[PDB]
Amino acid sequence: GHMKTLSPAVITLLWRQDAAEFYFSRLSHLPWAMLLHSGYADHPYSRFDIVVAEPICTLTTFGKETVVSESEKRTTTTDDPLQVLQQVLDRADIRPTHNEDLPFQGGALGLFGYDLGRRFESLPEIAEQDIVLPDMAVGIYDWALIVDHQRHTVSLLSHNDVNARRAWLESQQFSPQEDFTLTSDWQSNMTREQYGEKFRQVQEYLHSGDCYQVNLAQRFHATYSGDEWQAFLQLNQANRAPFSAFLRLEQGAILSLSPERFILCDNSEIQTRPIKGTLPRLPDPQEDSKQAVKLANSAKDRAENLMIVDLMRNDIGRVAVAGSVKVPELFVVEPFPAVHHLVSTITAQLPEQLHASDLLRAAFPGGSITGAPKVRAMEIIDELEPQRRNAWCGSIGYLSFCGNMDTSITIRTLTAINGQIFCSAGGGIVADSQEEAEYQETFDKVNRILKQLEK
Amino acid sequence: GMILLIDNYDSFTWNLYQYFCELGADVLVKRNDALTLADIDALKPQKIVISPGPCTPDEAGISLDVIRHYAGRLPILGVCLGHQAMAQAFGGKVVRAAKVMHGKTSPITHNGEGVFRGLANPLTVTRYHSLVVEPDSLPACFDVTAWSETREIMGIRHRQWDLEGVQFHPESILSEQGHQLLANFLHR
Ligand SMILES: C=C(O[C@@H]1C=C(C(=O)O)C=C[C@H]1O)C(=O)O
Ligand SMILES: N[C@@H](Cc1c[nH]c2ccccc12)C(=O)O
Ligand SMILES: [Cl-]
Ligand SMILES: [Cl-]
Ligand SMILES: [Mg+2]
Ligand SMILES: [Mg+2]
């Protein structure tokens, strides 16, 4: 019955900077335990780490079917998966007001895989489906643990007995597992020669006017043993990426070291921050300073970026309040441990009759990892990439009961399933792209991740 | 007040929607295979805009038929692919440019006519195109309104009817005076 609009009850825990990894350690083996981590990054959009587990409802989408699971009820539907997600959110009857210090007040959290985009556009079926992991794997949570690095506050919130949730958390124990070890070398799904053939086919499409940009990716695979959580602890420290995440799913684990925000909806203010443009970090600090200026002044990288800025204005423009779409920032350089990136910022407003779930449906998957025009680019990706992307170049994030949302692009993200680990790497092919430079750009983005796991 | 925007499966169409809505237009967006001519007659749009898109006018669904049927009946604006389609509809030819221009601005010179009424000359505009209208086969019913530095056609307008094309994107974040350009089509 009773709709709840009351703000959730909050217990403040001891401030420690490592609170999220500390508490998550005892949860990391549970299916539907999830961590969003800001990577301890010194970054304008690194503030929050969020921990959930023990969902009240789960949503699992494989192709045309979504399975909605709740304590004594399992339902299957062919309906639009984001429409079904919004229905499940509404039926929870938890409707708190926005709190700028608690941006997730319970709600939906999980994975929107790249192949969920097949529900939103009609796409060909050439690339092979060789990973069985859901297109959507989302929990509904009536509590959360929020770490706020700006206020130095750890908040445990619940809509249903926060003291009982605190005692549940204290009762969970971190009984550590064997360390992570790779048990094979990394191997790609394509040779240098195959990559070359595919690069040249993209350039034929650029010159024929089929497309203006296509993101072409390869995939590295290895076997592994030991605990995926231990791998993440090592990677998170080293990557300092503000949109990182660890998901324990029924089918395997997602280890995301993404530096990329897809879409934020914060009190109806929309933000998207497409990353397009890359150079490697150089070890000499004087040379590395010059490297940042080279990327900022690169004409090829500015074209690659601008095209995605106009595409994201379009994608947000499908739902934004008329006149609200703005570009406050073009071509800022952000340094990360492996690479310098060029990032731009687009803002807009969400209309009151729409939901963040409608904004996700209008924009998914990100133009920054497809290209332009997006439908044609996604057709070319399916034609040239030997396997479907699955979790990689999808999104992780939350849709709060208050209406807020935040999402990543799952670049720099590993999939750990059935003792196999997969790590993909791509880049935007445009008219001024060169074959060897684009091949090496894929390695520049993930070489440090691949090499850290070999030890 | 009612503008029908034909979407050629493009990733810039909704920038045109946003600019026309900001100007106070009511805008309906339909994909190029989601409508028949009969459907358009029942909707009774005041004007039609043909969006940008991938490939050539032959792959643009209903766009060529809409141009041929409503020519002289309702004002039509063609943007990039829409401009190419307008030239092709009256017997012009769409050919590869000397240099593709994708996410690059260019200064264009114009005659201050059609949608260039009141705009500064030259005008810096964003290009997203591999193809151009071949100048030799441009139908006699069209005046060239704008040129690139290498004398590529950047705009055309019909001598008799409200039927006008631009090769560039007025709605790009780096194009100059794109709201005013589209306002000319909306309010004239
Ligand atoms: C697909 C990737 O590349 C994407 C495109 C970039 C580029 O091409 O410069 C940079 C960031 C990413 O949005 C990747 O990170 O693996
Ligand atoms: N960096 C975000 C929170 C965040 C961390 N990892 C994420 C992954 C996906 C979405 C959001 C996040 C913030 O400070 O608010
Ligand atoms: Cl469907
Ligand atoms: Cl801190
Ligand atoms: Mg690049
Ligand atoms: Mg509603």
mmCIF file with all atom_site columns, N, CA and C in Angstrom, chain A residues 121 206-212 303 306-307 309-311 313-314 317-318 320-325 327 330 373-376 431-432, chain B residues 9-15 17-19 21-22 31 53-56 96 99-100 102-105 126 128-131 171-174:
data_model
loop_
_atom_site.group_PDB
_atom_site.id
_atom_site.type_symbol
_atom_site.label_atom_id
_atom_site.label_alt_id
_atom_site.label_comp_id
_atom_site.label_asym_id
_atom_site.label_entity_id
_atom_site.label_seq_id
_atom_site.pdbx_PDB_ins_code
_atom_site.Cartn_x
_atom_site.Cartn_y
_atom_site.Cartn_z
_atom_site.occupancy
_atom_site.B_iso_or_equiv
_atom_site.pdbx_formal_charge
_atom_site.auth_seq_id
_atom_site.auth_comp_id
_atom_site.auth_asym_id
_atom_site.auth_atom_id
_atom_site.pdbx_PDB_model_num
ATOM 1   N N  . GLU A 1 121 ? 17.422 -0.357 -31.875 1.00 0.00 ? 121 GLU A N  1
ATOM 2   C CA . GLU A 1 121 ? 17.589 -0.196 -33.338 1.00 0.00 ? 121 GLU A CA 1
ATOM 3   C C  . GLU A 1 121 ? 17.637 -1.597 -33.948 1.00 0.00 ? 121 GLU A C  1
ATOM 4   N N  . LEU A 1 206 ? 34.386 5.579  -45.135 1.00 0.00 ? 206 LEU A N  1
ATOM 5   C CA . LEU A 1 206 ? 34.556 7.024  -44.874 1.00 0.00 ? 206 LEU A CA 1
ATOM 6   C C  . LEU A 1 206 ? 34.547 7.760  -46.237 1.00 0.00 ? 206 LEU A C  1
ATOM 7   N N  . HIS A 1 207 ? 35.246 7.213  -47.240 1.00 0.00 ? 207 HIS A N  1
ATOM 8   C CA . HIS A 1 207 ? 35.450 7.883  -48.552 1.00 0.00 ? 207 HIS A CA 1
ATOM 9   C C  . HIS A 1 207 ? 34.171 7.766  -49.407 1.00 0.00 ? 207 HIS A C  1
ATOM 10  N N  . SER A 1 208 ? 33.344 6.737  -49.206 1.00 0.00 ? 208 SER A N  1
ATOM 11  C CA . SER A 1 208 ? 32.073 6.545  -49.948 1.00 0.00 ? 208 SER A CA 1
ATOM 12  C C  . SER A 1 208 ? 30.940 7.386  -49.327 1.00 0.00 ? 208 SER A C  1
ATOM 13  N N  . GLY A 1 209 ? 31.143 7.969  -48.141 1.00 0.00 ? 209 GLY A N  1
ATOM 14  C CA . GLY A 1 209 ? 30.099 8.753  -47.446 1.00 0.00 ? 209 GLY A CA 1
ATOM 15  C C  . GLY A 1 209 ? 29.126 7.878  -46.661 1.00 0.00 ? 209 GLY A C  1
ATOM 16  N N  . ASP A 1 210 ? 29.429 6.582  -46.475 1.00 0.00 ? 210 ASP A N  1
ATOM 17  C CA . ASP A 1 210 ? 28.644 5.701  -45.567 1.00 0.00 ? 210 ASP A CA 1
ATOM 18  C C  . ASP A 1 210 ? 28.697 6.213  -44.124 1.00 0.00 ? 210 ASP A C  1
ATOM 19  N N  . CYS A 1 211 ? 29.861 6.679  -43.661 1.00 0.00 ? 211 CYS A N  1
ATOM 20  C CA . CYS A 1 211 ? 30.079 7.060  -42.243 1.00 0.00 ? 211 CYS A CA 1
ATOM 21  C C  . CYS A 1 211 ? 31.207 8.077  -42.157 1.00 0.00 ? 211 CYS A C  1
ATOM 22  N N  . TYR A 1 212 ? 31.312 8.735  -41.003 1.00 0.00 ? 212 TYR A N  1
ATOM 23  C CA . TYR A 1 212 ? 32.317 9.781  -40.704 1.00 0.00 ? 212 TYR A CA 1
ATOM 24  C C  . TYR A 1 212 ? 33.279 9.287  -39.626 1.00 0.00 ? 212 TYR A C  1
ATOM 25  N N  . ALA A 1 303 ? 38.768 16.759 -34.657 1.00 0.00 ? 303 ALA A N  1
ATOM 26  C CA . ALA A 1 303 ? 37.701 16.336 -35.589 1.00 0.00 ? 303 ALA A CA 1
ATOM 27  C C  . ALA A 1 303 ? 36.972 15.117 -35.002 1.00 0.00 ? 303 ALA A C  1
ATOM 28  N N  . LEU A 1 306 ? 34.959 16.512 -32.039 1.00 0.00 ? 306 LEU A N  1
ATOM 29  C CA . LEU A 1 306 ? 33.853 17.443 -32.376 1.00 0.00 ? 306 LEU A CA 1
ATOM 30  C C  . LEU A 1 306 ? 32.653 16.652 -32.913 1.00 0.00 ? 306 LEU A C  1
ATOM 31  N N  . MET A 1 307 ? 32.902 15.646 -33.718 1.00 0.00 ? 307 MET A N  1
ATOM 32  C CA . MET A 1 307 ? 31.823 14.911 -34.404 1.00 0.00 ? 307 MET A CA 1
ATOM 33  C C  . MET A 1 307 ? 30.928 14.235 -33.351 1.00 0.00 ? 307 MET A C  1
ATOM 34  N N  . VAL A 1 309 ? 30.748 15.287 -30.164 1.00 0.00 ? 309 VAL A N  1
ATOM 35  C CA . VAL A 1 309 ? 30.034 16.381 -29.467 1.00 0.00 ? 309 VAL A CA 1
ATOM 36  C C  . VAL A 1 309 ? 28.707 16.672 -30.212 1.00 0.00 ? 309 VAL A C  1
ATOM 37  N N  . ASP A 1 310 ? 28.742 16.854 -31.531 1.00 0.00 ? 310 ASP A N  1
ATOM 38  C CA . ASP A 1 310 ? 27.488 17.129 -32.285 1.00 0.00 ? 310 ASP A CA 1
ATOM 39  C C  . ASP A 1 310 ? 26.536 15.919 -32.180 1.00 0.00 ? 310 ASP A C  1
ATOM 40  N N  . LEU A 1 311 ? 27.056 14.684 -32.232 1.00 0.00 ? 311 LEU A N  1
ATOM 41  C CA . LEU A 1 311 ? 26.221 13.466 -32.070 1.00 0.00 ? 311 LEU A CA 1
ATOM 42  C C  . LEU A 1 311 ? 25.607 13.419 -30.668 1.00 0.00 ? 311 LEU A C  1
ATOM 43  N N  . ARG A 1 313 ? 24.939 15.995 -28.688 1.00 0.00 ? 313 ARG A N  1
ATOM 44  C CA . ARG A 1 313 ? 23.910 17.066 -28.651 1.00 0.00 ? 313 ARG A CA 1
ATOM 45  C C  . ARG A 1 313 ? 22.581 16.493 -29.228 1.00 0.00 ? 313 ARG A C  1
ATOM 46  N N  . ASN A 1 314 ? 22.689 15.694 -30.265 1.00 0.00 ? 314 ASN A N  1
ATOM 47  C CA . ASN A 1 314 ? 21.569 15.048 -30.997 1.00 0.00 ? 314 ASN A CA 1
ATOM 48  C C  . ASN A 1 314 ? 20.899 14.031 -30.076 1.00 0.00 ? 314 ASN A C  1
ATOM 49  N N  . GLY A 1 317 ? 19.418 15.712 -27.276 1.00 0.00 ? 317 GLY A N  1
ATOM 50  C CA . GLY A 1 317 ? 18.402 16.558 -27.929 1.00 0.00 ? 317 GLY A CA 1
ATOM 51  C C  . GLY A 1 317 ? 17.125 15.821 -28.280 1.00 0.00 ? 317 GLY A C  1
ATOM 52  N N  . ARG A 1 318 ? 17.154 14.497 -28.413 1.00 0.00 ? 318 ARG A N  1
ATOM 53  C CA . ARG A 1 318 ? 15.920 13.698 -28.668 1.00 0.00 ? 318 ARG A CA 1
ATOM 54  C C  . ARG A 1 318 ? 14.928 13.936 -27.501 1.00 0.00 ? 318 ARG A C  1
ATOM 55  N N  . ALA A 1 320 ? 15.707 16.362 -24.519 1.00 0.00 ? 320 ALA A N  1
ATOM 56  C CA . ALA A 1 320 ? 15.971 17.575 -23.732 1.00 0.00 ? 320 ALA A CA 1
ATOM 57  C C  . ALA A 1 320 ? 14.891 18.633 -23.942 1.00 0.00 ? 320 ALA A C  1
ATOM 58  N N  . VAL A 1 321 ? 14.640 19.396 -22.896 1.00 0.00 ? 321 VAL A N  1
ATOM 59  C CA . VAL A 1 321 ? 13.810 20.629 -22.965 1.00 0.00 ? 321 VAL A CA 1
ATOM 60  C C  . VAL A 1 321 ? 14.371 21.519 -24.092 1.00 0.00 ? 321 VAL A C  1
ATOM 61  N N  . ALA A 1 322 ? 13.506 22.034 -24.974 1.00 0.00 ? 322 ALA A N  1
ATOM 62  C CA . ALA A 1 322 ? 13.932 22.868 -26.112 1.00 0.00 ? 322 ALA A CA 1
ATOM 63  C C  . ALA A 1 322 ? 14.741 24.052 -25.628 1.00 0.00 ? 322 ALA A C  1
ATOM 64  N N  . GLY A 1 323 ? 15.912 24.248 -26.201 1.00 0.00 ? 323 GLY A N  1
ATOM 65  C CA . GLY A 1 323 ? 16.773 25.385 -25.869 1.00 0.00 ? 323 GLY A CA 1
ATOM 66  C C  . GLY A 1 323 ? 17.732 25.097 -24.724 1.00 0.00 ? 323 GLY A C  1
ATOM 67  N N  . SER A 1 324 ? 17.657 23.932 -24.075 1.00 0.00 ? 324 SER A N  1
ATOM 68  C CA . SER A 1 324 ? 18.507 23.627 -22.884 1.00 0.00 ? 324 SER A CA 1
ATOM 69  C C  . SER A 1 324 ? 19.874 23.007 -23.254 1.00 0.00 ? 324 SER A C  1
ATOM 70  N N  . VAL A 1 325 ? 20.114 22.570 -24.485 1.00 0.00 ? 325 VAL A N  1
ATOM 71  C CA . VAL A 1 325 ? 21.365 21.854 -24.844 1.00 0.00 ? 325 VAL A CA 1
ATOM 72  C C  . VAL A 1 325 ? 22.512 22.845 -25.020 1.00 0.00 ? 325 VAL A C  1
ATOM 73  N N  . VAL A 1 327 ? 27.139 23.441 -24.686 1.00 0.00 ? 327 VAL A N  1
ATOM 74  C CA . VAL A 1 327 ? 28.482 22.795 -24.662 1.00 0.00 ? 327 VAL A CA 1
ATOM 75  C C  . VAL A 1 327 ? 29.390 23.711 -23.842 1.00 0.00 ? 327 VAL A C  1
ATOM 76  N N  . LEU A 1 330 ? 34.859 22.302 -24.494 1.00 0.00 ? 330 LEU A N  1
ATOM 77  C CA . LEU A 1 330 ? 35.306 21.555 -25.694 1.00 0.00 ? 330 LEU A CA 1
ATOM 78  C C  . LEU A 1 330 ? 36.805 21.278 -25.562 1.00 0.00 ? 330 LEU A C  1
ATOM 79  N N  . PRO A 1 373 ? 27.308 8.337  -38.812 1.00 0.00 ? 373 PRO A N  1
ATOM 80  C CA . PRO A 1 373 ? 26.049 8.236  -38.080 1.00 0.00 ? 373 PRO A CA 1
ATOM 81  C C  . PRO A 1 373 ? 26.011 6.913  -37.286 1.00 0.00 ? 373 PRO A C  1
ATOM 82  N N  . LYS A 1 374 ? 25.323 6.901  -36.149 1.00 0.00 ? 374 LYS A N  1
ATOM 83  C CA . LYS A 1 374 ? 25.461 5.794  -35.165 1.00 0.00 ? 374 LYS A CA 1
ATOM 84  C C  . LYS A 1 374 ? 24.908 4.469  -35.688 1.00 0.00 ? 374 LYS A C  1
ATOM 85  N N  . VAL A 1 375 ? 23.761 4.485  -36.341 1.00 0.00 ? 375 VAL A N  1
ATOM 86  C CA . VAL A 1 375 ? 23.147 3.202  -36.806 1.00 0.00 ? 375 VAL A CA 1
ATOM 87  C C  . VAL A 1 375 ? 24.086 2.587  -37.843 1.00 0.00 ? 375 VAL A C  1
ATOM 88  N N  . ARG A 1 376 ? 24.525 3.376  -38.836 1.00 0.00 ? 376 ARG A N  1
ATOM 89  C CA . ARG A 1 376 ? 25.464 2.846  -39.858 1.00 0.00 ? 376 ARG A CA 1
ATOM 90  C C  . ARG A 1 376 ? 26.757 2.366  -39.176 1.00 0.00 ? 376 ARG A C  1
ATOM 91  N N  . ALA A 1 431 ? 38.980 10.105 -41.096 1.00 0.00 ? 431 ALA A N  1
ATOM 92  C CA . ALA A 1 431 ? 39.598 10.210 -42.430 1.00 0.00 ? 431 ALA A CA 1
ATOM 93  C C  . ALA A 1 431 ? 41.115 10.305 -42.276 1.00 0.00 ? 431 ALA A C  1
ATOM 94  N N  . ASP A 1 432 ? 41.592 11.038 -41.289 1.00 0.00 ? 432 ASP A N  1
ATOM 95  C CA . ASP A 1 432 ? 43.054 11.320 -41.108 1.00 0.00 ? 432 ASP A CA 1
ATOM 96  C C  . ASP A 1 432 ? 43.718 10.212 -40.275 1.00 0.00 ? 432 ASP A C  1
ATOM 97  N N  . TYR B 2 9   ? 17.916 8.374  -40.792 1.00 0.00 ? 9   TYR B N  1
ATOM 98  C CA . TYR B 2 9   ? 18.648 7.504  -39.828 1.00 0.00 ? 9   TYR B CA 1
ATOM 99  C C  . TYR B 2 9   ? 19.952 8.161  -39.364 1.00 0.00 ? 9   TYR B C  1
ATOM 100 N N  . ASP B 2 10  ? 19.855 9.437  -39.063 1.00 0.00 ? 10  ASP B N  1
ATOM 101 C CA . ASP B 2 10  ? 21.046 10.299 -38.862 1.00 0.00 ? 10  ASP B CA 1
ATOM 102 C C  . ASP B 2 10  ? 21.271 10.556 -37.390 1.00 0.00 ? 10  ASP B C  1
ATOM 103 N N  . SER B 2 11  ? 22.474 11.046 -37.070 1.00 0.00 ? 11  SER B N  1
ATOM 104 C CA . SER B 2 11  ? 22.891 11.402 -35.704 1.00 0.00 ? 11  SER B CA 1
ATOM 105 C C  . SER B 2 11  ? 23.035 12.916 -35.543 1.00 0.00 ? 11  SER B C  1
ATOM 106 N N  . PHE B 2 12  ? 22.483 13.707 -36.471 1.00 0.00 ? 12  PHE B N  1
ATOM 107 C CA . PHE B 2 12  ? 22.399 15.179 -36.334 1.00 0.00 ? 12  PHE B CA 1
ATOM 108 C C  . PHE B 2 12  ? 20.963 15.688 -36.454 1.00 0.00 ? 12  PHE B C  1
ATOM 109 N N  . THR B 2 13  ? 20.003 14.889 -36.930 1.00 0.00 ? 13  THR B N  1
ATOM 110 C CA . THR B 2 13  ? 18.584 15.309 -37.097 1.00 0.00 ? 13  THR B CA 1
ATOM 111 C C  . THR B 2 13  ? 18.009 16.011 -35.880 1.00 0.00 ? 13  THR B C  1
ATOM 112 N N  . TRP B 2 14  ? 18.292 15.530 -34.669 1.00 0.00 ? 14  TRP B N  1
ATOM 113 C CA . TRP B 2 14  ? 17.641 16.105 -33.471 1.00 0.00 ? 14  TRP B CA 1
ATOM 114 C C  . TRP B 2 14  ? 18.295 17.439 -33.081 1.00 0.00 ? 14  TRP B C  1
ATOM 115 N N  . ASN B 2 15  ? 19.476 17.780 -33.631 1.00 0.00 ? 15  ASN B N  1
ATOM 116 C CA . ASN B 2 15  ? 20.017 19.158 -33.479 1.00 0.00 ? 15  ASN B CA 1
ATOM 117 C C  . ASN B 2 15  ? 19.112 20.105 -34.296 1.00 0.00 ? 15  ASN B C  1
ATOM 118 N N  . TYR B 2 17  ? 15.906 19.547 -34.977 1.00 0.00 ? 17  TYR B N  1
ATOM 119 C CA . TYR B 2 17  ? 14.698 19.578 -34.121 1.00 0.00 ? 17  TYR B CA 1
ATOM 120 C C  . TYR B 2 17  ? 14.871 20.611 -33.008 1.00 0.00 ? 17  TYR B C  1
ATOM 121 N N  . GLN B 2 18  ? 15.980 20.540 -32.255 1.00 0.00 ? 18  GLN B N  1
ATOM 122 C CA . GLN B 2 18  ? 16.205 21.461 -31.129 1.00 0.00 ? 18  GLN B CA 1
ATOM 123 C C  . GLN B 2 18  ? 16.188 22.926 -31.614 1.00 0.00 ? 18  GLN B C  1
ATOM 124 N N  . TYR B 2 19  ? 16.917 23.234 -32.672 1.00 0.00 ? 19  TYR B N  1
ATOM 125 C CA . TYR B 2 19  ? 16.980 24.648 -33.142 1.00 0.00 ? 19  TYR B CA 1
ATOM 126 C C  . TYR B 2 19  ? 15.601 25.133 -33.586 1.00 0.00 ? 19  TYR B C  1
ATOM 127 N N  . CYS B 2 21  ? 12.592 23.990 -32.630 1.00 0.00 ? 21  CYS B N  1
ATOM 128 C CA . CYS B 2 21  ? 11.790 24.147 -31.389 1.00 0.00 ? 21  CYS B CA 1
ATOM 129 C C  . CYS B 2 21  ? 12.186 25.405 -30.623 1.00 0.00 ? 21  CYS B C  1
ATOM 130 N N  . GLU B 2 22  ? 13.467 25.745 -30.546 1.00 0.00 ? 22  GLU B N  1
ATOM 131 C CA . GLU B 2 22  ? 13.888 26.974 -29.855 1.00 0.00 ? 22  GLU B CA 1
ATOM 132 C C  . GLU B 2 22  ? 13.314 28.191 -30.543 1.00 0.00 ? 22  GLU B C  1
ATOM 133 N N  . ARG B 2 31  ? 11.163 8.937  -39.386 1.00 0.00 ? 31  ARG B N  1
ATOM 134 C CA . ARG B 2 31  ? 12.205 8.263  -40.176 1.00 0.00 ? 31  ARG B CA 1
ATOM 135 C C  . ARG B 2 31  ? 11.718 8.129  -41.631 1.00 0.00 ? 31  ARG B C  1
ATOM 136 N N  . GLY B 2 53  ? 22.240 12.517 -43.640 1.00 0.00 ? 53  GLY B N  1
ATOM 137 C CA . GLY B 2 53  ? 22.350 11.083 -43.329 1.00 0.00 ? 53  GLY B CA 1
ATOM 138 C C  . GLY B 2 53  ? 23.479 10.417 -44.076 1.00 0.00 ? 53  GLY B C  1
ATOM 139 N N  . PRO B 2 54  ? 23.666 9.096  -43.830 1.00 0.00 ? 54  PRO B N  1
ATOM 140 C CA . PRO B 2 54  ? 24.724 8.324  -44.469 1.00 0.00 ? 54  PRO B CA 1
ATOM 141 C C  . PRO B 2 54  ? 24.341 8.032  -45.916 1.00 0.00 ? 54  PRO B C  1
ATOM 142 N N  . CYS B 2 55  ? 25.352 7.686  -46.710 1.00 0.00 ? 55  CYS B N  1
ATOM 143 C CA . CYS B 2 55  ? 25.195 7.176  -48.086 1.00 0.00 ? 55  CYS B CA 1
ATOM 144 C C  . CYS B 2 55  ? 24.652 8.275  -49.031 1.00 0.00 ? 55  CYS B C  1
ATOM 145 N N  . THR B 2 56  ? 23.810 7.919  -50.017 1.00 0.00 ? 56  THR B N  1
ATOM 146 C CA . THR B 2 56  ? 23.427 8.805  -51.147 1.00 0.00 ? 56  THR B CA 1
ATOM 147 C C  . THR B 2 56  ? 21.919 9.007  -51.108 1.00 0.00 ? 56  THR B C  1
ATOM 148 N N  . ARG B 2 96  ? 31.816 12.254 -55.477 1.00 0.00 ? 96  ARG B N  1
ATOM 149 C CA . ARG B 2 96  ? 32.805 12.379 -54.384 1.00 0.00 ? 96  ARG B CA 1
ATOM 150 C C  . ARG B 2 96  ? 33.434 13.768 -54.483 1.00 0.00 ? 96  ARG B C  1
ATOM 151 N N  . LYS B 2 99  ? 38.222 16.343 -51.401 1.00 0.00 ? 99  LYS B N  1
ATOM 152 C CA . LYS B 2 99  ? 38.675 16.026 -50.019 1.00 0.00 ? 99  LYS B CA 1
ATOM 153 C C  . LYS B 2 99  ? 37.427 15.832 -49.153 1.00 0.00 ? 99  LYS B C  1
ATOM 154 N N  . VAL B 2 100 ? 37.319 14.689 -48.480 1.00 0.00 ? 100 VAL B N  1
ATOM 155 C CA . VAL B 2 100 ? 36.236 14.514 -47.470 1.00 0.00 ? 100 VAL B CA 1
ATOM 156 C C  . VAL B 2 100 ? 36.475 15.535 -46.356 1.00 0.00 ? 100 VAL B C  1
ATOM 157 N N  . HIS B 2 102 ? 34.951 15.976 -42.491 1.00 0.00 ? 102 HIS B N  1
ATOM 158 C CA . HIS B 2 102 ? 34.166 15.311 -41.406 1.00 0.00 ? 102 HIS B CA 1
ATOM 159 C C  . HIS B 2 102 ? 34.596 15.912 -40.078 1.00 0.00 ? 102 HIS B C  1
ATOM 160 N N  . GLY B 2 103 ? 33.751 16.761 -39.476 1.00 0.00 ? 103 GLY B N  1
ATOM 161 C CA . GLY B 2 103 ? 34.088 17.392 -38.197 1.00 0.00 ? 103 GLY B CA 1
ATOM 162 C C  . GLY B 2 103 ? 35.180 18.419 -38.367 1.00 0.00 ? 103 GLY B C  1
ATOM 163 N N  . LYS B 2 104 ? 35.145 19.081 -39.532 1.00 0.00 ? 104 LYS B N  1
ATOM 164 C CA . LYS B 2 104 ? 36.067 20.210 -39.857 1.00 0.00 ? 104 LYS B CA 1
ATOM 165 C C  . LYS B 2 104 ? 35.225 21.407 -40.305 1.00 0.00 ? 104 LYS B C  1
ATOM 166 N N  . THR B 2 105 ? 35.594 22.609 -39.869 1.00 0.00 ? 105 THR B N  1
ATOM 167 C CA . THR B 2 105 ? 34.927 23.856 -40.316 1.00 0.00 ? 105 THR B CA 1
ATOM 168 C C  . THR B 2 105 ? 35.613 24.379 -41.578 1.00 0.00 ? 105 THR B C  1
ATOM 169 N N  . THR B 2 126 ? 30.469 24.012 -40.187 1.00 0.00 ? 126 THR B N  1
ATOM 170 C CA . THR B 2 126 ? 30.960 22.634 -40.006 1.00 0.00 ? 126 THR B CA 1
ATOM 171 C C  . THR B 2 126 ? 30.471 21.751 -41.133 1.00 0.00 ? 126 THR B C  1
ATOM 172 N N  . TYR B 2 128 ? 30.272 17.728 -42.643 1.00 0.00 ? 128 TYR B N  1
ATOM 173 C CA . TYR B 2 128 ? 30.196 16.268 -42.409 1.00 0.00 ? 128 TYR B CA 1
ATOM 174 C C  . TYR B 2 128 ? 29.807 15.616 -43.733 1.00 0.00 ? 128 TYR B C  1
ATOM 175 N N  . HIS B 2 129 ? 30.646 15.656 -44.775 1.00 0.00 ? 129 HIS B N  1
ATOM 176 C CA . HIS B 2 129 ? 30.256 15.125 -46.098 1.00 0.00 ? 129 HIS B CA 1
ATOM 177 C C  . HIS B 2 129 ? 31.469 14.652 -46.897 1.00 0.00 ? 129 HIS B C  1
ATOM 178 N N  . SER B 2 130 ? 31.288 13.536 -47.584 1.00 0.00 ? 130 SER B N  1
ATOM 179 C CA . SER B 2 130 ? 32.253 12.953 -48.541 1.00 0.00 ? 130 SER B CA 1
ATOM 180 C C  . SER B 2 130 ? 31.845 13.325 -49.962 1.00 0.00 ? 130 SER B C  1
ATOM 181 N N  . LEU B 2 131 ? 30.600 13.740 -50.177 1.00 0.00 ? 131 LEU B N  1
ATOM 182 C CA . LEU B 2 131 ? 30.048 13.965 -51.533 1.00 0.00 ? 131 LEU B CA 1
ATOM 183 C C  . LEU B 2 131 ? 29.572 15.419 -51.731 1.00 0.00 ? 131 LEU B C  1
ATOM 184 N N  . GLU B 2 171 ? 23.396 23.558 -37.788 1.00 0.00 ? 171 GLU B N  1
ATOM 185 C CA . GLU B 2 171 ? 23.043 23.137 -36.393 1.00 0.00 ? 171 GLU B CA 1
ATOM 186 C C  . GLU B 2 171 ? 24.265 22.616 -35.622 1.00 0.00 ? 171 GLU B C  1
ATOM 187 N N  . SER B 2 172 ? 25.461 22.568 -36.214 1.00 0.00 ? 172 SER B N  1
ATOM 188 C CA . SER B 2 172 ? 26.713 22.163 -35.530 1.00 0.00 ? 172 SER B CA 1
ATOM 189 C C  . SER B 2 172 ? 27.128 23.226 -34.515 1.00 0.00 ? 172 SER B C  1
ATOM 190 N N  . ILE B 2 173 ? 27.736 22.802 -33.381 1.00 0.00 ? 173 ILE B N  1
ATOM 191 C CA . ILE B 2 173 ? 28.175 23.728 -32.319 1.00 0.00 ? 173 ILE B CA 1
ATOM 192 C C  . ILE B 2 173 ? 29.216 24.721 -32.876 1.00 0.00 ? 173 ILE B C  1
ATOM 193 N N  . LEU B 2 174 ? 29.959 24.390 -33.926 1.00 0.00 ? 174 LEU B N  1
ATOM 194 C CA . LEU B 2 174 ? 31.017 25.329 -34.412 1.00 0.00 ? 174 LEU B CA 1
ATOM 195 C C  . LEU B 2 174 ? 30.536 26.106 -35.650 1.00 0.00 ? 174 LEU B C  1
#
